[PDB]
Amino acid sequence: MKFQYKEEHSFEKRKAEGEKIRRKYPDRVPVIVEKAPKARLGDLDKKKYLVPSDLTVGQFYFLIRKRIHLRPEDALFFFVNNVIPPTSATMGSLYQEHHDEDFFLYIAFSDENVY
């Protein structure tokens, strides 16, 4: 998966921040959210989130949908490691299982279920 955020920050800088964030808040998780190339959607102002580990994936869908000014009828899909995570997962367990070596978790979003 390709992320602007990874290309615009040195990996060492990214890793040292993920690492300290996780030391300072073990009940929060650092997440990067970006639009997959050519989704037919607005993009997010804010890329970088520190979400409480108890928030569900379904509840984060909802905050990301507000931030891009979706109507409730428009589709949205998340992809972590090219896999669509379930809404019933917590952001904590999703982080534990799928975080980057830089200690961020990366989510791509689209209007399509693969694209």
CSV table of N, CA, C and O in Angstrom, one decimal:
chain,number,residue,atom,x,y,z
A,1,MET,N,0.9,-1.2,0.0
A,1,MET,CA,0.0,0.0,0.0
A,1,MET,C,0.9,1.3,0.0
A,1,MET,O,1.8,1.3,0.8
A,2,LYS,N,0.6,2.2,-0.9
A,2,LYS,CA,1.4,3.5,-0.9
A,2,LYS,C,0.8,4.7,-0.3
A,2,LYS,O,-0.3,5.1,-0.6
A,3,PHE,N,1.5,5.3,0.6
A,3,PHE,CA,1.0,6.5,1.4
A,3,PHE,C,1.9,7.7,1.2
A,3,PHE,O,3.1,7.6,1.5
A,4,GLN,N,1.3,8.8,0.9
A,4,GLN,CA,2.0,10.1,0.9
A,4,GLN,C,2.6,10.4,2.2
A,4,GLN,O,3.7,11.1,2.3
A,5,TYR,N,2.1,9.9,3.2
A,5,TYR,CA,2.6,10.3,4.5
A,5,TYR,C,4.0,9.6,4.7
A,5,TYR,O,4.9,10.2,5.3
A,6,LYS,N,4.1,8.4,4.3
A,6,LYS,CA,5.4,7.7,4.3
A,6,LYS,C,6.4,8.3,3.5
A,6,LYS,O,7.5,8.4,3.9
A,7,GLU,N,6.1,8.8,2.3
A,7,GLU,CA,7.0,9.5,1.4
A,7,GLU,C,7.5,10.9,1.8
A,7,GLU,O,8.6,11.3,1.5
A,8,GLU,N,6.7,11.6,2.6
A,8,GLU,CA,6.9,12.9,3.1
A,8,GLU,C,7.6,13.1,4.5
A,8,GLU,O,8.0,14.1,4.9
A,9,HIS,N,7.6,11.9,5.2
A,9,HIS,CA,8.4,11.9,6.5
A,9,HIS,C,9.4,10.8,6.4
A,9,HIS,O,9.1,9.7,5.9
A,10,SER,N,10.6,11.0,6.7
A,10,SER,CA,11.7,10.0,6.9
A,10,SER,C,11.1,8.9,7.8
A,10,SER,O,10.3,9.1,8.7
A,11,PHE,N,11.5,7.7,7.5
A,11,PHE,CA,11.0,6.5,8.2
A,11,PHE,C,11.5,6.6,9.7
A,11,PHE,O,10.7,6.3,10.6
A,12,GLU,N,12.7,7.0,9.9
A,12,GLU,CA,13.2,7.1,11.3
A,12,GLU,C,12.5,8.1,12.2
A,12,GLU,O,12.3,7.9,13.3
A,13,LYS,N,12.1,9.2,11.5
A,13,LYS,CA,11.3,10.2,12.2
A,13,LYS,C,9.9,9.7,12.5
A,13,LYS,O,9.5,9.8,13.7
A,14,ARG,N,9.3,9.0,11.6
A,14,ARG,CA,8.0,8.4,11.7
A,14,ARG,C,8.0,7.3,12.9
A,14,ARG,O,7.1,7.3,13.7
A,15,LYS,N,9.1,6.5,12.9
A,15,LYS,CA,9.1,5.4,13.9
A,15,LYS,C,9.3,5.9,15.3
A,15,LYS,O,8.8,5.4,16.2
A,16,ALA,N,10.2,7.0,15.4
A,16,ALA,CA,10.4,7.5,16.7
A,16,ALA,C,9.2,8.3,17.3
A,16,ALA,O,9.1,8.4,18.5
A,17,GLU,N,8.3,8.7,16.4
A,17,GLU,CA,7.1,9.4,16.9
A,17,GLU,C,6.0,8.4,17.2
A,17,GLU,O,5.4,8.5,18.3
A,18,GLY,N,5.8,7.4,16.4
A,18,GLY,CA,4.9,6.3,16.7
A,18,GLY,C,5.3,5.6,18.0
A,18,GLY,O,4.5,5.3,18.8
A,19,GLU,N,6.7,5.5,18.3
A,19,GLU,CA,7.2,4.8,19.4
A,19,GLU,C,6.9,5.6,20.7
A,19,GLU,O,6.4,5.0,21.6
A,20,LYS,N,7.1,6.9,20.7
A,20,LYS,CA,6.9,7.8,21.8
A,20,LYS,C,5.4,8.0,22.2
A,20,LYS,O,5.0,8.1,23.3
A,21,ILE,N,4.6,8.2,21.1
A,21,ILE,CA,3.1,8.2,21.2
A,21,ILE,C,2.5,7.0,21.9
A,21,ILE,O,1.7,7.1,22.8
A,22,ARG,N,3.0,5.8,21.5
A,22,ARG,CA,2.6,4.6,22.2
A,22,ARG,C,3.1,4.4,23.6
A,22,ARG,O,2.6,3.5,24.4
A,23,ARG,N,4.2,5.1,24.0
A,23,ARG,CA,4.8,5.1,25.4
A,23,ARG,C,4.0,6.0,26.2
A,23,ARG,O,3.6,5.7,27.3
A,24,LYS,N,3.7,7.2,25.7
A,24,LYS,CA,2.9,8.2,26.4
A,24,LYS,C,1.4,7.9,26.5
A,24,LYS,O,0.9,8.1,27.6
A,25,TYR,N,0.8,7.3,25.5
A,25,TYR,CA,-0.6,6.9,25.6
A,25,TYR,C,-0.8,5.4,25.2
A,25,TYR,O,-1.2,5.1,24.0
A,26,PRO,N,-0.6,4.4,26.1
A,26,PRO,CA,-1.0,3.1,25.7
A,26,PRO,C,-2.5,2.8,25.6
A,26,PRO,O,-2.9,1.8,25.1
A,27,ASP,N,-3.3,3.8,26.0
A,27,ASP,CA,-4.8,3.6,25.7
A,27,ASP,C,-5.2,4.5,24.5
A,27,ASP,O,-6.4,4.8,24.3
A,28,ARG,N,-4.3,4.8,23.6
A,28,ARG,CA,-4.6,5.5,22.4
A,28,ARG,C,-3.7,4.8,21.2
A,28,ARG,O,-2.7,4.2,21.5
A,29,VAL,N,-4.2,4.9,20.0
A,29,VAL,CA,-3.4,4.4,18.9
A,29,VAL,C,-3.2,5.4,17.8
A,29,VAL,O,-4.2,6.0,17.4
A,30,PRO,N,-2.0,5.4,17.2
A,30,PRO,CA,-1.7,6.4,16.1
A,30,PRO,C,-2.1,5.9,14.8
A,30,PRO,O,-1.7,4.8,14.4
A,31,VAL,N,-2.9,6.6,14.1
A,31,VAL,CA,-3.4,6.1,12.8
A,31,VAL,C,-3.2,7.2,11.6
A,31,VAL,O,-3.4,8.4,11.8
A,32,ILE,N,-2.8,6.7,10.5
A,32,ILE,CA,-2.8,7.5,9.3
A,32,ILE,C,-3.9,7.0,8.3
A,32,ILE,O,-4.0,5.8,8.0
A,33,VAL,N,-4.7,7.9,7.9
A,33,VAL,CA,-5.9,7.7,7.0
A,33,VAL,C,-5.7,8.5,5.7
A,33,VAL,O,-5.5,9.8,5.8
A,34,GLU,N,-5.6,7.9,4.5
A,34,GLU,CA,-5.5,8.6,3.2
A,34,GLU,C,-6.4,7.9,2.2
A,34,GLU,O,-6.7,6.7,2.3
A,35,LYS,N,-6.8,8.7,1.2
A,35,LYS,CA,-7.6,8.2,0.1
A,35,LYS,C,-6.8,7.4,-0.9
A,35,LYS,O,-5.8,7.8,-1.3
A,36,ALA,N,-7.2,6.1,-1.1
A,36,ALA,CA,-6.5,5.3,-2.1
A,36,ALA,C,-6.5,6.1,-3.5
A,36,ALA,O,-7.5,6.8,-3.8
A,37,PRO,N,-5.5,6.0,-4.3
A,37,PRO,CA,-5.3,6.7,-5.5
A,37,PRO,C,-6.6,6.6,-6.3
A,37,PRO,O,-7.2,5.5,-6.4
A,38,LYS,N,-7.1,7.7,-6.9
A,38,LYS,CA,-8.4,7.7,-7.7
A,38,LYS,C,-9.6,6.9,-7.1
A,38,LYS,O,-10.3,6.2,-7.8
A,39,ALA,N,-9.9,7.1,-5.8
A,39,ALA,CA,-11.2,7.0,-5.3
A,39,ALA,C,-12.0,8.2,-5.8
A,39,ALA,O,-11.3,9.2,-6.1
A,40,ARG,N,-13.3,8.1,-5.8
A,40,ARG,CA,-14.2,9.2,-6.4
A,40,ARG,C,-14.8,9.9,-5.2
A,40,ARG,O,-16.1,10.0,-5.1
A,41,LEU,N,-14.0,10.4,-4.3
A,41,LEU,CA,-14.3,11.0,-3.0
A,41,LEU,C,-13.6,12.2,-2.7
A,41,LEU,O,-12.5,12.4,-3.3
A,42,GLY,N,-14.1,13.1,-1.8
A,42,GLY,CA,-13.2,14.1,-1.3
A,42,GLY,C,-12.0,13.6,-0.5
A,42,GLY,O,-12.0,12.4,-0.3
A,43,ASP,N,-10.9,14.3,-0.3
A,43,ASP,CA,-9.9,13.9,0.7
A,43,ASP,C,-10.0,14.5,2.1
A,43,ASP,O,-10.8,15.5,2.3
A,44,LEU,N,-9.3,13.9,3.0
A,44,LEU,CA,-9.3,14.4,4.4
A,44,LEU,C,-8.4,15.6,4.5
A,44,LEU,O,-7.3,15.5,4.1
A,45,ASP,N,-8.8,16.6,5.2
A,45,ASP,CA,-7.9,17.6,5.8
A,45,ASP,C,-6.7,16.9,6.7
A,45,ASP,O,-5.6,17.0,6.3
A,46,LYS,N,-7.1,16.2,7.7
A,46,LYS,CA,-6.3,15.7,8.7
A,46,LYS,C,-6.0,14.3,8.4
A,46,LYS,O,-6.9,13.5,8.2
A,47,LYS,N,-4.7,13.9,8.3
A,47,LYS,CA,-4.2,12.6,8.0
A,47,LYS,C,-4.0,11.8,9.3
A,47,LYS,O,-4.1,10.6,9.2
A,48,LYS,N,-3.6,12.5,10.3
A,48,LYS,CA,-3.0,11.8,11.5
A,48,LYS,C,-3.9,11.9,12.7
A,48,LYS,O,-4.2,13.0,13.2
A,49,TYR,N,-4.2,10.7,13.2
A,49,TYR,CA,-5.2,10.6,14.3
A,49,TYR,C,-4.6,9.8,15.5
A,49,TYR,O,-3.7,9.0,15.3
A,50,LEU,N,-5.0,10.1,16.7
A,50,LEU,CA,-4.6,9.4,17.9
A,50,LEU,C,-5.9,9.0,18.5
A,50,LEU,O,-6.5,9.8,19.2
A,51,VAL,N,-6.3,7.7,18.2
A,51,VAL,CA,-7.7,7.3,18.6
A,51,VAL,C,-7.6,6.4,19.8
A,51,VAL,O,-6.6,5.8,20.1
A,52,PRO,N,-8.7,6.5,20.6
A,52,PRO,CA,-8.7,5.7,21.8
A,52,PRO,C,-8.7,4.2,21.3
A,52,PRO,O,-9.5,3.9,20.4
A,53,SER,N,-7.9,3.3,21.9
A,53,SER,CA,-8.0,1.9,21.6
A,53,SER,C,-9.3,1.2,21.7
A,53,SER,O,-9.4,0.1,21.1
A,54,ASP,N,-10.3,1.7,22.5
A,54,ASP,CA,-11.6,1.1,22.7
A,54,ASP,C,-12.6,1.5,21.6
A,54,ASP,O,-13.7,0.9,21.6
A,55,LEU,N,-12.3,2.5,20.8
A,55,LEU,CA,-13.2,2.9,19.8
A,55,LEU,C,-13.2,1.7,18.8
A,55,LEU,O,-12.2,1.2,18.4
A,56,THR,N,-14.4,1.5,18.2
A,56,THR,CA,-14.5,0.4,17.2
A,56,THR,C,-14.2,0.9,15.9
A,56,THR,O,-14.1,2.1,15.7
A,57,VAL,N,-14.0,0.0,14.9
A,57,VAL,CA,-13.7,0.4,13.5
A,57,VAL,C,-14.9,1.0,13.0
A,57,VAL,O,-14.8,2.0,12.2
A,58,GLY,N,-16.1,0.5,13.3
A,58,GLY,CA,-17.3,1.1,12.9
A,58,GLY,C,-17.5,2.5,13.4
A,58,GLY,O,-18.1,3.4,12.7
A,59,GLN,N,-17.0,2.8,14.6
A,59,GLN,CA,-17.1,4.1,15.1
A,59,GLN,C,-16.1,5.1,14.4
A,59,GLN,O,-16.4,6.3,14.2
A,60,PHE,N,-15.0,4.6,14.0
A,60,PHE,CA,-14.0,5.4,13.3
A,60,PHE,C,-14.5,5.6,11.8
A,60,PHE,O,-14.5,6.8,11.4
A,61,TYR,N,-15.0,4.6,11.0
A,61,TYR,CA,-15.7,4.8,9.8
A,61,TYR,C,-16.5,6.0,10.0
A,61,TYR,O,-16.5,6.9,9.1
A,62,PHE,N,-17.3,6.1,11.0
A,62,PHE,CA,-18.3,7.2,11.1
A,62,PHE,C,-17.6,8.6,11.2
A,62,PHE,O,-18.1,9.6,10.6
A,63,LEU,N,-16.5,8.7,11.9
A,63,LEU,CA,-15.8,10.0,12.1
A,63,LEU,C,-15.1,10.4,10.8
A,63,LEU,O,-15.0,11.6,10.4
A,64,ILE,N,-14.6,9.4,10.0
A,64,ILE,CA,-13.9,9.7,8.8
A,64,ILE,C,-15.0,10.1,7.7
A,64,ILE,O,-14.7,11.1,7.0
A,65,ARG,N,-16.1,9.4,7.7
A,65,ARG,CA,-17.3,9.9,6.9
A,65,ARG,C,-17.7,11.3,7.2
A,65,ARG,O,-18.0,12.0,6.2
A,66,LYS,N,-17.8,11.7,8.4
A,66,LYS,CA,-18.1,13.1,8.7
A,66,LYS,C,-17.0,14.0,8.2
A,66,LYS,O,-17.3,15.1,7.6
A,67,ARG,N,-15.7,13.7,8.4
A,67,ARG,CA,-14.6,14.6,8.0
A,67,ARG,C,-14.6,14.8,6.5
A,67,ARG,O,-14.0,15.8,6.1
A,68,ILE,N,-15.1,13.8,5.7
A,68,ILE,CA,-15.1,14.0,4.2
A,68,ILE,C,-16.5,14.4,3.6
A,68,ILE,O,-16.6,14.5,2.4
A,69,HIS,N,-17.4,14.6,4.5
A,69,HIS,CA,-18.7,15.3,4.2
A,69,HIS,C,-19.5,14.4,3.3
A,69,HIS,O,-20.3,14.8,2.5
A,70,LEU,N,-19.5,13.1,3.7
A,70,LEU,CA,-20.3,12.0,3.1
A,70,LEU,C,-21.7,12.2,3.5
A,70,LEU,O,-22.0,12.8,4.5
A,71,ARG,N,-22.6,11.8,2.6
A,71,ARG,CA,-24.0,11.6,2.9
A,71,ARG,C,-24.2,10.2,3.4
A,71,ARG,O,-23.4,9.3,2.9
A,72,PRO,N,-25.1,10.0,4.3
A,72,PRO,CA,-25.2,8.6,4.9
A,72,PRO,C,-25.4,7.5,3.9
A,72,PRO,O,-25.1,6.3,4.2
A,73,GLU,N,-25.9,7.8,2.7
A,73,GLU,CA,-26.1,6.8,1.6
A,73,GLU,C,-24.9,6.5,0.8
A,73,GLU,O,-25.0,5.6,0.0
A,74,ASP,N,-23.9,7.3,0.8
A,74,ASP,CA,-22.7,7.1,0.1
A,74,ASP,C,-21.8,5.9,0.7
A,74,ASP,O,-21.8,5.8,2.0
A,75,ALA,N,-21.1,5.2,-0.1
A,75,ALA,CA,-20.3,4.0,0.4
A,75,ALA,C,-19.0,4.5,0.9
A,75,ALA,O,-18.5,5.4,0.4
A,76,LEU,N,-18.5,3.8,1.9
A,76,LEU,CA,-17.1,3.9,2.2
A,76,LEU,C,-16.6,2.6,2.7
A,76,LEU,O,-17.2,2.0,3.5
A,77,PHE,N,-15.4,2.4,2.2
A,77,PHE,CA,-14.6,1.2,2.6
A,77,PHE,C,-13.2,1.6,3.1
A,77,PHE,O,-12.6,2.5,2.4
A,78,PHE,N,-12.8,1.0,4.2
A,78,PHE,CA,-11.4,1.0,4.7
A,78,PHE,C,-10.6,-0.2,4.3
A,78,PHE,O,-11.1,-1.3,4.1
A,79,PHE,N,-9.3,0.0,4.1
A,79,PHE,CA,-8.4,-1.1,3.7
A,79,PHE,C,-7.2,-0.9,4.6
A,79,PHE,O,-6.5,0.2,4.6
A,80,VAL,N,-6.9,-2.0,5.4
A,80,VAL,CA,-5.6,-2.0,6.1
A,80,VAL,C,-4.9,-3.2,5.5
A,80,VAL,O,-5.4,-4.3,5.6
A,81,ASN,N,-3.7,-3.0,5.0
A,81,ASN,CA,-3.0,-4.1,4.3
A,81,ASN,C,-3.8,-4.8,3.2
A,81,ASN,O,-3.9,-6.0,3.1
A,82,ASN,N,-4.5,-3.9,2.5
A,82,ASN,CA,-5.4,-4.3,1.4
A,82,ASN,C,-6.6,-5.2,1.8
A,82,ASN,O,-7.2,-5.8,0.9
A,83,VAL,N,-6.8,-5.3,3.1
A,83,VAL,CA,-7.9,-6.1,3.6
A,83,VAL,C,-8.9,-5.2,4.3
A,83,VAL,O,-8.5,-4.2,4.9
A,84,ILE,N,-10.2,-5.3,4.0
A,84,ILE,CA,-11.2,-4.5,4.6
A,84,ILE,C,-11.5,-5.1,6.0
A,84,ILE,O,-12.0,-6.1,6.2
A,85,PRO,N,-11.1,-4.3,7.1
A,85,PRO,CA,-11.3,-4.8,8.4
A,85,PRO,C,-12.8,-4.8,8.8
A,85,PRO,O,-13.6,-4.0,8.3
A,86,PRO,N,-13.2,-5.6,9.8
A,86,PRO,CA,-14.7,-5.6,10.2
A,86,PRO,C,-15.0,-4.4,11.1
A,86,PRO,O,-14.1,-4.0,11.9
A,87,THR,N,-16.2,-3.8,10.9
A,87,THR,CA,-16.6,-2.7,11.8
A,87,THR,C,-16.7,-3.0,13.3
A,87,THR,O,-16.6,-2.1,14.2
A,88,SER,N,-16.8,-4.3,13.7
A,88,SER,CA,-16.9,-4.8,15.1
A,88,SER,C,-15.6,-4.9,15.7
A,88,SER,O,-15.5,-5.1,16.9
A,89,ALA,N,-14.5,-4.8,15.0
A,89,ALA,CA,-13.1,-4.8,15.6
A,89,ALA,C,-12.9,-3.4,16.3
A,89,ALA,O,-13.4,-2.4,16.0
A,90,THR,N,-12.0,-3.5,17.4
A,90,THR,CA,-11.7,-2.3,18.1
A,90,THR,C,-10.5,-1.7,17.3
A,90,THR,O,-9.7,-2.5,16.7
A,91,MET,N,-10.3,-0.4,17.4
A,91,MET,CA,-9.1,0.1,16.9
A,91,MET,C,-7.8,-0.4,17.5
A,91,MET,O,-6.7,-0.3,16.9
A,92,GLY,N,-7.9,-0.8,18.8
A,92,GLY,CA,-6.7,-1.3,19.5
A,92,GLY,C,-6.3,-2.7,18.9
A,92,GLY,O,-5.1,-2.9,18.6
A,93,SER,N,-7.2,-3.6,18.7
A,93,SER,CA,-6.8,-4.9,18.2
A,93,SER,C,-6.4,-4.8,16.8
A,93,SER,O,-5.5,-5.6,16.3
A,94,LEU,N,-7.0,-3.9,16.1
A,94,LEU,CA,-6.6,-3.6,14.7
A,94,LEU,C,-5.2,-3.1,14.6
A,94,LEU,O,-4.4,-3.5,13.7
A,95,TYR,N,-4.9,-2.1,15.4
A,95,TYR,CA,-3.5,-1.6,15.6
A,95,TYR,C,-2.5,-2.8,15.9
A,95,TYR,O,-1.4,-2.9,15.3
A,96,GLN,N,-2.8,-3.6,16.9
A,96,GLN,CA,-1.9,-4.6,17.4
A,96,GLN,C,-1.5,-5.6,16.3
A,96,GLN,O,-0.4,-6.1,16.3
A,97,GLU,N,-2.4,-5.9,15.5
A,97,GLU,CA,-2.3,-6.9,14.5
A,97,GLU,C,-1.7,-6.4,13.2
A,97,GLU,O,-1.3,-7.2,12.4
A,98,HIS,N,-1.9,-5.1,12.9
A,98,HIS,CA,-1.6,-4.5,11.6
A,98,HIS,C,-0.7,-3.3,11.5
A,98,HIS,O,-0.6,-2.7,10.4
A,99,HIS,N,-0.1,-2.9,12.6
A,99,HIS,CA,0.6,-1.7,12.6
A,99,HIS,C,1.9,-1.8,11.7
A,99,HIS,O,2.4,-2.8,11.5
A,100,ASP,N,2.4,-0.6,11.3
A,100,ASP,CA,3.6,-0.6,10.5
A,100,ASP,C,4.7,-0.7,11.4
A,100,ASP,O,4.6,-0.5,12.6
A,101,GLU,N,5.9,-0.9,10.8
A,101,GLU,CA,7.1,-0.9,11.5
A,101,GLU,C,7.5,0.4,12.1
A,101,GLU,O,8.3,0.5,13.0
A,102,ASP,N,6.9,1.4,11.6
A,102,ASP,CA,7.0,2.8,12.2
A,102,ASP,C,6.0,3.0,13.4
A,102,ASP,O,5.9,4.1,13.9
A,103,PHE,N,5.3,2.0,13.7
A,103,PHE,CA,4.3,2.0,14.9
A,103,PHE,C,3.1,2.9,14.7
A,103,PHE,O,2.4,3.2,15.6
A,104,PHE,N,2.8,3.4,13.4
A,104,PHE,CA,1.5,3.9,13.0
A,104,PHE,C,0.7,2.8,12.4
A,104,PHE,O,1.2,1.8,11.9
A,105,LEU,N,-0.6,2.9,12.5
A,105,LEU,CA,-1.4,2.0,11.7
A,105,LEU,C,-1.9,2.9,10.5
A,105,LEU,O,-2.3,4.1,10.7
A,106,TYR,N,-1.9,2.3,9.3
A,106,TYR,CA,-2.3,3.0,8.0
A,106,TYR,C,-3.6,2.4,7.5
A,106,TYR,O,-3.7,1.2,7.3
A,107,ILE,N,-4.5,3.3,7.2
A,107,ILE,CA,-5.8,2.9,6.6
A,107,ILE,C,-6.0,3.7,5.3
A,107,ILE,O,-5.9,5.0,5.3
A,108,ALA,N,-6.2,3.0,4.2
A,108,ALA,CA,-6.6,3.7,3.0
A,108,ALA,C,-8.2,3.7,2.9
A,108,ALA,O,-8.8,2.8,3.3
A,109,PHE,N,-8.8,4.7,2.3
A,109,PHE,CA,-10.2,4.6,2.1
A,109,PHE,C,-10.6,4.8,0.6
A,109,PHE,O,-9.9,5.4,-0.2
A,110,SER,N,-11.8,4.3,0.2
A,110,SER,CA,-12.3,4.4,-1.1
A,110,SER,C,-13.8,4.3,-1.0
A,110,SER,O,-14.4,3.9,0.0
A,111,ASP,N,-14.5,4.7,-2.1
A,111,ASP,CA,-15.9,4.5,-2.4
A,111,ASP,C,-16.2,3.1,-3.0
A,111,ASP,O,-17.3,2.7,-3.0
A,112,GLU,N,-15.1,2.3,-3.3
A,112,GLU,CA,-15.3,1.0,-3.9
A,112,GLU,C,-14.7,-0.1,-3.0
A,112,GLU,O,-13.8,0.2,-2.3
A,113,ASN,N,-15.2,-1.3,-3.1
A,113,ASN,CA,-14.7,-2.4,-2.2
A,113,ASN,C,-13.4,-3.0,-2.6
A,113,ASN,O,-13.0,-4.0,-2.0
A,114,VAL,N,-12.8,-2.6,-3.7
A,114,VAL,CA,-11.4,-3.0,-3.9
A,114,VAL,C,-10.6,-1.8,-4.2
A,114,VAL,O,-9.4,-1.7,-3.8
A,115,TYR,N,-11.1,-0.9,-5.0
A,115,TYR,CA,-10.4,0.2,-5.6
A,115,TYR,C,-9.9,1.2,-4.6
A,115,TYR,O,-8.8,1.0,-4.1
